[PDB]
Design a protein around this ligand. Structure first.
Ligand SMILES: CC(C)(COP(=O)(O)OP(=O)(O)OC[C@H]1O[C@@H](n2cnc3c(N)ncnc32)[C@H](O)[C@@H]1OP(=O)(O)O)[C@@H](O)C(=O)NCCC(=O)NCCS
Ligand SMILES: CC(C)(COP(=O)(O)OP(=O)(O)OC[C@H]1O[C@@H](n2cnc3c(N)ncnc32)[C@H](O)[C@@H]1OP(=O)(O)O)[C@@H](O)C(=O)NCCC(=O)NCCS
Lengths: 167, 167
């Protein structure tokens, strides 16, 4: 397999993989982003995310005829105390393609991106019940991040943003 | 007062304000970013954060002689299900300058940035004990975001990123 940066032509596959992950989490209907959205947000003049994809040889394409079997979606964030961070948002390899080393190589590639960008750390969320991914990550040096303990996450949605923008 | 995007010349003030906020939270020694860091990460060819600052007339500069009395530090993030988000990281107005409407105007400006960028929401963290800021935000339409419930935050620091990058 090959791990490489996605191109505008991979948007179809990125959305397909985003939906497979959402389905793995039983929330596929949550995905309202379109292929056009991904193209615009990812390969327009200012990318709001970056993506690496895992591509297999044609001989081994999926039953559906797709060459992309995994991906990682990330973007850079900033911490006022320490600086640049690489934030890994989505990370998924199709069932039939797991345990082959694809996820490990994607993480190695992300690590190189982090060092090239001089990020001091890579941050990400893992579901509490997912011991297999927790072990995967921790075997590669991850540790718990307590930074948000004692803090509540809030959102101000479009309706209210528009109200404030025009008050 | 004037709310405006920061310029490279404001880096000194941004670091000063970052430290005042850290001090308000009794963790000022946590701040290891330098002025040079902020200049490089914020006004170099690729900004890793954006900043708005609140500037007062010279007649009303701080006892230390500074014109900048508040700021908001933010960057854009991405959610694979809904797209673009505006993430507000730091938000602080100096004590003697609070309750004058500076924070409200900074949030209005951020809201305009969110709509201009077509972000569907603005996300941010607030300390559990800070009822005053919680009320401030909620009066302006904020609501709890449950997206991370059942999830653990993890980090892979530079040491381990370097190890994986070179394995
Ligand atoms: C691991 C994951 C993140 C993607 O990666 P992946 O391609 O399966 O994983 P890798 O093949 O590199 O394998 C990791 C392992 O395979 C085993 N492995 C790796 N290469 C192997 C090979 N060539 N032969 C046999 N076993 C191998 C190892 O035991 C490592 O397990 P370890 O976790 O105990 O250290 C996958 O669980 C995925 O999509 N999982 C479901 C979604 C998910 O949990 N995502 C992250 C958070 S929501
Ligand atoms: C509000 C905060 C975020 C910055 O903003 P600010 O300039 O003080 O606030 P504003 O002046 O726009 O005032 C908000 C209020 O002032 C009062 N107010 C606003 N303009 C006013 C005026 N001209 N005259 C009198 N009262 C006024 C209102 O009651 C509003 O309170 P409300 O919160 O109940 O809706 C400030 O608390 C700050 O730095 N706080 C400490 C750090 C912090 O908590 N940061 C966020 C998270 S770590």
């Amino acid at each position: 397999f090959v791990i490489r940066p996605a191109t505008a032509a991979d948007c179809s596959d990125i959305l397909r993989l985003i939906k497979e992950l959402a389905r793995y989490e039983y929330m596929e209907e949550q995905v309202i982003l379109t292929e056009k959205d991904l193209l615009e947000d990812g390969f327009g003049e200012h990318p709001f995310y970056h993506c690496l994809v895992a591509e297999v040889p044609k001989e081994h394409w999926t039953p559906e005829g797709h060459s992309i079997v995994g991906f990682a979606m990330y973007y850079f964030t900033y911490d006022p105390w320490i600086g640049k961070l690489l934030y890994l948002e989505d990370f998924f390899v199709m069932s039939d393609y797991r345990g082959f080393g694809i996820g490990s190589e994607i993480l190695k590639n992300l690590s190189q991106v982090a060092m090239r960008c001089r990020c001091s750390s890579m941050h990400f969320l893992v579901a509490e019940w997912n011991e297999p991914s927790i072990n995967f990550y921790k075997r590669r040096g991850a540790s718990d991040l307590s930074s948000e303990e004692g803090w509540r996450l809030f959102k101000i949605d479009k309706e209210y943003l528009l109200k404030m923008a025009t008050e």
